[PDB]
Amino acid sequence: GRVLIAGATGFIGQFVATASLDAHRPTYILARFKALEDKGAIIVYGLINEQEAMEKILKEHEIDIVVSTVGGESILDQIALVKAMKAVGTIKRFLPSEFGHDVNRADPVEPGLNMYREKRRVRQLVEESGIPFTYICCNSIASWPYYNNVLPPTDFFQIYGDGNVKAYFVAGTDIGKFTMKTVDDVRTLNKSVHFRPSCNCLNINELASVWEKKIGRTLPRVTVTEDDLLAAAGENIIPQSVVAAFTHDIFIKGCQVNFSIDGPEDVEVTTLYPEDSFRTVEECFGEYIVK
């Protein structure tokens, strides 16, 4: 199947585009990069918010799989993309711009809640339009989780709340690799795919300690309270306050870990692809040290 990726120069999109090419999939990358092209990508021109233009591309290039990685501020640009895929009727799988939490289960404060409102709206449209779908709920990219946003700190650690709430951290390269595995898997059709690598389930205190090992010394630790984060969210400064709201949901409320994925509409990456190891946080934090 031919893959079209929208947002391939984006933060997440670069990993997904690169993984697709590595897997020897025919990959088309939508342009409003040199490394992408050298690796085999075909560049096509347009914007996902122009319905007619998208219908043309999907038809002319015989696209089977569409993956959108547009940013938090462009979620509703996908509305015209969904109408376009419904029109051409030949799409075998659509992955919207999801790449985070389960937007149905999580309940962040504003203004994070508005972004989830928009992603839910796109899901409703996808499902009513009968387009086959996969929702990538891949939790947190493996990084230092700065409340407003590279590298982890070298002065002091800001620890949210008790620093004892677990989250899942996934290498950008693993986000890409495992995402592309799902696009034509029978087991991920019309499912949410959750990324729960058991070795990468860490709290902020454990993240700090991993980093302390890498830098060969300790830093003081200071508390950033729940109210500190809610005050930052309450400023409604975009996109910083959005990240503050998500930080509160993850590290104060436990949103990544506080639900079962046992039901028929949820699958989990490590059980789908057994004996296929995720990179560790130790490993990722090791490559920052090469700078």
Ligand X SMILES: NC(=O)C1=CN([C@@H]2O[C@H](COP(=O)(O)OP(=O)(O)OC[C@H]3O[C@@H](n4cnc5c(N)ncnc54)[C@H](OP(=O)(O)O)[C@@H]3O)[C@@H](O)[C@H]2O)C=CC1
Among the listed residues 28, 94, 99, 251, the single contact to ligand X using CB under 6 A: 99
11 annotated ligand-binding residue: yes
Choose between 32 and 291: whose C-beta lies nearer to ligand X: 32
What is d(CA 281, CA 131) in angstroms, rounded to the nearest whole number? 35
Q: Which stretch binds ligand X (CB under 6 A): 20-28, 43-51, 155-163, 214-222?
A: 43-51
214 annotated ligand-binding residue: no
Task: Give the phi and the psi of residue 106 in degrees, each rounded to 5.
Answer: -70, 145
Q: What is the DSSP letter of 290?
A: -
100 sits near ligand X (criterion: CB under 6 A) = yes
The DSSP bridge partners found for residue 194 are 137, 268
Choose between 31 and 231: whose C-beta lies nearer to ligand X: 31
51 to 35, 55, 81, 101, 123: CA distances (angstroms): 29, 6, 6, 28, 18
Q: Which stretch binds ligand X (CB under 6 A): 8-16, 19-27, 213-221, 280-288?
A: 8-16
Could you tell me the strand order of the sheet in which 93-95 lies?
42-45, 27-31, 3-6, 65-68, 93-95
Choose between 24 and 32: whose C-beta lies nearer to ligand X: 32
Q: Tokens 């779908």 appear where?
A: 133
Contact map string, positions 118 to 157, toward ligand X, x by CB under 6 A = --------------------x-xx----------------
Among the listed residues 55, 77, 102, 174, the single contact to ligand X using CB under 6 A: 77
Choose between 30 and 233: whose C-beta lies nearer to ligand X: 30
What is d(CA 192, CA 158) in angstroms, rounded to the nearest whole number? 32
70 sits near ligand X (criterion: CB under 6 A) = yes
Choose between 9 and 129: whose C-beta lies nearer to ligand X: 9
42 annotated ligand-binding residue: no
Strands (E), 27-85: 27-31, 42-45, 65-68
What is d(CA 110, CA 115) in angstroms, rounded to the nearest whole number? 9
What is d(CA 223, CA 147) in angstroms, rounded to the nearest whole number? 13
7 annotated ligand-binding residue: yes
What is d(CA 215, CA 49) in angstroms, rounded to the nearest whole number? 45
92 annotated ligand-binding residue: no
Binding residues for NADP(+): 9-12, 32, 48-49, 77, 97, 99, 119, 139, 141
- Site for ligand X, rule CB under 6 A: 6-7, 9-13, 30, 32, 47-49, 69-72, 74, 77, 97, 99-100, 138, 140-141
